[PDB]
């Protein structure tokens, strides 16, 4: 994989090459407005160690940091995600620690309302590949990396509350 983040829009001033996950960029670059990926794809972090918001790139060119979806020029840690092939599978669960009612998803839902009915998910289990999970339909919204493993709780992926709009894989 390969990312280069620019300080400012438009692909311009300071900028940084990466080609691995890493737990703080700061001594890097200290701001980004601009992104290009090569290659890879990439979970960014505004915070060090793969905390604060995240957010979902792949392939192609960001000339400002609405782009990504982005809720300040902050990126300061990032994750390479491992490209899962075949089967991606995960199982979410009404209430916490994998209680109430179970489904399974092995493809991509733009809508948790229009296929389940459901606005919230409070616990899910992640068997095969990464995903990303979004706030709101259609891929938008607030973002967070799951990756295989268990959440029993809505905050162990990132969020302040069991929202839940729409589910990816992460795929080239």
């Known amino acids: 994989g390969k990312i280069t983040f620019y300080e400012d829009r438009g692909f311009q001033g300071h900028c940084y090459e990466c080609s691995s996950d890493c737990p703080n960029l700061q001594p890097y670059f200290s701001r980004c407005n601009s992104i290009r990926v090569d290659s890879g794809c990439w979970m960014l972090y505004e915070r060090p160690n793969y905390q604060g918001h995240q957010y979902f790139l792949r392939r192609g060119d960001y000339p400002d940091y609405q782009q990504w979806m982005g809720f300040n ?67 938008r919204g607030r973002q967070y990396l799951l990756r295989p493993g268990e959440y029993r709780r809505y905050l162990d992926w990132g969020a302040m509350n069991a929202k839940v709009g729409s589910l990816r894989r992460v795929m080239d």
Do not use: A, K
């Open 73 to 139: 020029d902050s990126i300061r840690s990032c994750r390479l995600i491992p490209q899962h092939t075949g089967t991606f599978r995960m199982r979410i669960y009404e209430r916490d620690d994998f209680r109430g009612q179970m489904s399974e998803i092995t493809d991509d839902c733009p809508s948790l309302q229009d296929r389940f009915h459901l606005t919230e998910v409070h616990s899910l289990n992640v068997l095969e590949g990464s995903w990303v999970l979004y706030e709101m339909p259609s891929y």
